[PDB]
């Protein structure tokens, strides 16, 4: 019944790809606030 399954380390790359893809979009907005402060 899929006894004692482990998620290996391919899945943890997809797990780690989530945190990086947000931390880009974290930083992408922080640039965007500056460039409309720069238009201000």
Curated annotation (Swiss-Prot):
Belongs to the PMP-22/EMP/MP20 family. CACNG subfamily. The L-type calcium channel is composed of five subunits: alpha-1, alpha-2/delta, beta and gamma. Acts as an auxiliary subunit for AMPA-selective glutamate receptors (AMPARs). Found in a complex with GRIA1, GRIA2, GRIA3, GRIA4, CNIH2, CNIH3, CACNG2, CACNG4, CACNG5, CACNG7 and CACNG8. Interacts with AP4M1 and GRIA1; associates GRIA1 with the adaptor protein complex 4 (AP-4) to target GRIA1 to the somatodendritic compartment of neurons. The chain crosses the membrane at residues 13-29. The lineage of its organism: Eukaryota, Metazoa, Chordata, Craniata, Vertebrata. It is found in: Membrane. This is Voltage-dependent calcium channel gamma-3 subunit. The chain holds residues 170 to 207 of 315 of the full protein. It comes from the Eukaryota. Regulates the trafficking to the somatodendritic compartment and gating properties of AMPA-selective glutamate receptors (AMPARs). Promotes their targeting to the cell membrane and synapses and modulates their gating properties by slowing their rates of activation, deactivation and desensitization. Does not show subunit-specific AMPA receptor regulation and regulates all AMPAR subunits. Thought to stabilize the calcium channel in an inactivated (closed) state. It comes from Rattus norvegicus (Rat).
């Amino acid at each position: 019944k899929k006894n004692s399954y482990s998620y290996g380390w391919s899945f943890y790359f997809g797990a780690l790809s989530f945190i990086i893809a947000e931390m880009v979009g974290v930083l992408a907005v922080h640039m965007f606030i500056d460039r409309h402060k720069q238009l201000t």
